[PDB]
From Swiss-Prot:
The keyword Transmembrane helix does not apply. Glycans are attached at residues 1, 7, 34, 37, 41. It comes from Bos taurus. Changing residue 12 to A: Loss of activity. The gene is RNASE1. Belongs to the pancreatic ribonuclease family. This is Ribonuclease pancreatic. The active site is at 12 (proton acceptor), 119 (proton donor).
Length: 124
């Protein structure tokens, strides 16, 4: 099985680009990361920062998670992100996504040792 940390990296990290340049970014990335394999994952965001910067959020502002747990952290600064969301049209296996690029703070749940991001909570 994939570890939680590895899964977070595969689904959410894209340090290779500074921002999504095309409206087709999500369609390509969702496919490349194998997120459209058995179904179309409906929502998924990509962070365009280095892995080290994202991991460093686990030592930033501690906040409650939407679930009430307290292992969530919000980034002190805004980061480049791309939100991918399935369009009302979209039908597996013809996955189609809307790409929305933005700069905002991210909120992640961290766990383990080393203590790293394992889940996204939100972005703001
Ligand atoms: Cl790992
Ligand atoms: Cl994979
Ligand atoms: Cl997400």
């Amino acid at each position: 099985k994939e570890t939680a940390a590895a899964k977070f990296e595969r689904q959410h990290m894209d340090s290779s680009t500074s921002a999504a340049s095309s409206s087709n970014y999500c369609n390509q990335m969702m496919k490349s990361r194998n997120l459209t394999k058995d179904r179309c994952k409906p929502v998924n965001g990509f962070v365009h920062e280095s892995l080290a910067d994202v991991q460093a959020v686990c030592s930033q502002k501690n906040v409650a998670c939407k679930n009430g747990q307290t292992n969530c952290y919000q980034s002190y600064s805004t980061m480049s992100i791309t939100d991918c969301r399935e369009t009302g049209s979209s039908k597996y296996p013809n996955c189609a996504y809307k790409t929305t690029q933005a700069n905002k703070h991210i909120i992640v749940a961290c766990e383990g040792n080393p203590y790293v991001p394992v889940h996204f909570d939100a972005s703001v």
